[PDB]
Amino acid sequence: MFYALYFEIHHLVASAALGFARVAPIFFFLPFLNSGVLSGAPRNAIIILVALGVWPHALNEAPPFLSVAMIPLVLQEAAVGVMLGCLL
């Protein structure tokens, strides 16, 4: 099926985008990751790579959240990330 690789790349970037919401706050709190040290073009490139390194589901199948209101979800994930940043 011809378009399947194209869709499979878009599923990847949608998963990475929703992972950034939960990984970036940690990079805000820790003293060796905050923007007093790591800044400019490296910063996003590294955060995204980590988020893809830890996402739990196979990257090549459609993301399950397409049916849901995006804002309540993004705020939920950011709150979780803030809690983890405190505990670490």
Partner: protein
Amino acid sequence: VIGQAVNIRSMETDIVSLDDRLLQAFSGSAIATAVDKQTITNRIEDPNLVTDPKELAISQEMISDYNLYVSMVSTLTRKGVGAVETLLRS
């Protein structure tokens, strides 16, 4: 001449039925159904329909809309994180 009609008193909207489709940015279920169909297909029917002008005009809608949806989510997450950082510094 034939079959002519006009509504005189009030601007009751009739070209469309006014509906909750006004109140959403993306018909995410219609995306999730189309993305299903173009991905469950693995060795059934046939590949390579680069060439028929009727199906090739249906692919144009999906290929565009999924690119827009993915582009939007990228901005919303940055905004959210930026709002949290803004409050925590201030």
